[PDB]
Structures are given as C-alpha cells and as structure tokens.
Design a binder for this molecule. Structure first.
Ligand SMILES: [Mg+2]
Ligand SMILES: [Mg+2]
Ligand SMILES: [Mg+2]
Ligand SMILES: [Mg+2]
Ligand SMILES: [Mg+2]
Ligand SMILES: [Mg+2]
Lengths: 76, 139, 141
RNA sequence: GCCCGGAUAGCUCAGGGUAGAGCAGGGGAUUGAAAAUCCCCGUGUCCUUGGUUCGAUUCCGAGUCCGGGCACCA
C-alpha cells in the first residue's frame, strides 16, 4: 500500500521494495501583466512545473493568466 | 479590440489545440481557436497529417482569415517505406528505398510551393529530403 | 605514453646534441607535418600531450603518425642527496630531436584541421617548430 | 593533480561475439506454524556522456568518482 516518508528522509521504508515516491503538487495560477511571460515560463521550467493552460484576458493587452501544476516543495 | 498583426508563424496540419504556440502569438487575436483544427485538419487530410503552418490576419473587430498547404516533404516520405525518424547516421545508411518515380508521385502534392512546375526539379527536390533521412534512389 | 618494451641497458650517458637531424627530415606518411627547429630531449609526457591534443581535434576522422620514439632513458638523483653514490634512477624516457626532423604527421584531414592540430601540438613541446606540407621534395627522397 | 586499477543487479562481487554468482528481498519447499537450511524469480539503461567496430562492460575520448604511491597538508 501507501504511507508517507515523514519528517525524516532517512526514515524511509526500505527502497528495496519500493515503486512510487510521491511529491505534493499544487495548482499554481500566475497573473502576469505582459510578456514577462517569457521570463515566467523559464522560471517555472526549472521549478519543474507542467504547463497545463494559459488564457489571455484581452482589453489592453498585457494581461495573461498561466496555470501550472508544480511540485509543492519547489516553491517554499 | 487587438491590432492588425501580420501572422507569419509555423504550425502543424493536425497537431491542433490551444497549447503554445496556440495562445502566445494568437493572443493578439480573438478567433475561433479550433479552426486550424477543424477546417485545416479535414480539408487537407487526403495527404495524411503532419506539419503545415497557417497565415491568419487579425483585424480589430476580431476577424480571422487563413490559408495553408502541404505536410512537409519529410512526412511525405514517412508513409513511403515506413519511417518515423531519419536513419540517424545516413550518408551511407540506406534503410528505406524508393524508385525514380515512386519518388515522382510525392511532388504531385507539394508541387505548388517551390517555383518548379517541372517535376524533375521538384523530384530531386523531395528526393533531397531523402538523403537527410537516408532513403535511396535505386540505380 | 611510450617507453621501450625492453632494453639492453637501463642507464645511458647524456651524449651531445649537435648537428641537423640525421634522418626523418621529410614528410613520409601523411599530408602535413610538424618539424623541429631546435634540438631537445622531448619527453614521453610531452609526446603524449601533443598526440592527445591533435586526437581531441580529430574527434571523428584523421590519422596521426608519431615519428619520434622516446628510447633514451632519463636519469635523476633522489632529491636532497649529495653528489656521488652512483648514477641516478631512471625516472622517464626522452626522444632526441635535432632540427629538421619530422616529429608528427597528420593525414585524412582538411588543411585547416591539419595546421591547427599541429599548431596546438607545437605549443606542448619545448622547442620552436614549423608546420610543413608534403612536397615534391619529400617524394624525391 | 600523479603512477598503478577500479566503477557490472537493492548490496558485496567473478568476467571483443550482449554478463553471471553469492546476498537483500518476493514467492515457494520443509513444519502444526516458525527459526535454520534449500528451491524459484526480476529493472541490470555492464557509472555518465561521445566515438570506434558487422559485433563493445572490453578499445579510443571526455566527465564524475573508489582503493593504494608521491605531493601539497601548526
Ligand atoms: Mg627535461
Ligand atoms: Mg639526465
Ligand atoms: Mg653526482
Ligand atoms: Mg642521474
Ligand atoms: Mg613550443
Ligand atoms: Mg602550531
């Protein structure tokens, strides 16, 4: 089954019999103005966030909204 | 109400949903996003699939207008003898092989794109995409 | 790095470094060569560093001809030791190179590749050198 | 850095025509059920990356590293 490598990376279960280590991810939404977007994406890349979605709220003209699934630990 | 940007880009006849670059460039827009899908993946589907871009024009009251063509000479050669890469190490690698007229059909489709309305200069054309994936011209 | 597989004698006297080279003065196997302009005991570690440098430059393609061999053993007393008590121990091998000698040759390689690989390789040796290109004069030899 | 070598399974390891064994495990045999013993079975991206070959753990590079030599190191 499953349980949590708690406040002790040392106190694992035996990585002998192991198949899935799970990070906490998070639904991460970024309201940038204009195409700082270019900067933003490079940042979220090395933070290992998957790009799921982006949407322009037009009007003038900057405003872009980015949605990301990213490992919770990679913020903090 | 976005300006009149001249929309030269590089998209694919099939791979079509609002993941980038469908979004960033077509931000300055307001068009029916799933139309390069719809009309382009359907009306030019006889050839197969693959990459062809699209030339839209945005006008301020959210107006689209686009025309396109033919999957890339490196696709029309992937149906040929069964490839989906090149040959990694060509110049000597003769994986698939074609005849001087089994590579005369492939320009029946990409003919209206170069400047050669002669399917000799349009044969060695698509047969040049051969070498950079290694498929040969027999004897 | 090169050393003889066996020797009649372990230690040998220093000798003089006089004269132009006796032979090996014409490009004999490749298209370009590096020739010595001054005499020297070129050590094996030097030869190895010159070889590798050109190799690295030919990462895909090329033949390297090393036409000098370090057969002369090099002797050195242990440090902080008074004069006497016999001749030092062999601590390495050198090749005696006199001016005019062709030390390295490259083939199978564009002119630019050849004169760049030989230029680096010169920078590894304790002597001034000259890069040369197989001549009718080599063919006549 | 250097000379010798030495990185092959979760671990300790044997070794130019695709490499195994102990071991840990999981399961099984034995038992009333265990311990001990024994059987069975894997993912090896033969340490990483590039090249050499028709064929590389092997050969040529580079990278990081491990055990012994020198050397720096009140
Ligand atoms: Mg010296
Ligand atoms: Mg001496
Ligand atoms: Mg003395
Ligand atoms: Mg001595
Ligand atoms: Mg010099
Ligand atoms: Mg002290």
């Amino acid at each position: 089954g499953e349980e949590v490598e708690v406040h002790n990376p040392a106190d694992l279960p035996d990585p002998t019999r192991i198949e899935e280590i799970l990070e906490p991810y998070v639904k991460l939404t970024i309201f940038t103005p204009e195409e700082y977007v270019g900067s933003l994406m490079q940042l979220l890349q090395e933070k290992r966030g998957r790009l799921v979605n982006m949407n322009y709220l037009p009007g003038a003209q900057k405003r872009v909204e980015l949605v990301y699934e990213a490992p919770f630990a990679e913020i903090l | 109400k976005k300006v009149v940007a001249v929309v030269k880009l590089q998209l694919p006849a099939g791979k079509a949903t609002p993941a980038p670059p469908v979004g960033p460039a077509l931000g300055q827009h307001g068009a029916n996003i799933m139309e390069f899908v719809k009309a382009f993946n359907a009306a030019t589907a006889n050839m197969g699939d693959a990459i062809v871009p699209v030339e839209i024009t945005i006008y301020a009251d959210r107006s689209f207008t686009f025309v396109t063509k033919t999957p890339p000479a490196s696709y029309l050669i992937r149906k040929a003898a069964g490839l989906e890469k090149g040959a990694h190490k060509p110049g000597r690698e003769k994986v698939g092989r074609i005849t001087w007229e089994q590579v005369l059909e492939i320009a029946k489709q990409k003919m209206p794109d170069l400047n050669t309305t002669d399917l000799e200069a349009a044969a060695r054309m698509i047969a040049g995409s051969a070498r950079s994936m290694g498929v040969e011209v027999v004897g | 790095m090169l050393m003889p597989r066996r020797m009649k004698y372990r230690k040998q006297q220093r000798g003089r470094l006089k004269g132009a080279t006796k032979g090996g003065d014409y490009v004999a196997f490749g298209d370009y060569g590096l020739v010595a302009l001054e005499p020297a005991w070129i050590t094996a570690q030097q030869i190895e560093a010159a070889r590798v440098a050109m190799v690295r430059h030919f990462r895909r393609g090329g033949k390297i001809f090393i036409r000098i061999f370090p057969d002369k053993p090099y002797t050195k007393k242990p440090l902080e030791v008074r004069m006497g008590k016999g001749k030092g121990n062999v601590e390495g091998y050198v090749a005696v190179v006199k001016p005019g000698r062709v030390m390295f040759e490259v083939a199978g390689v564009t002119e630019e590749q050849a004169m760049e690989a030989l230029r680096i390789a010169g920078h590894k040796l304790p002597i001034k050198t000259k890069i040369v290109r197989r001549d009718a004069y080599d063919e006549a030899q």
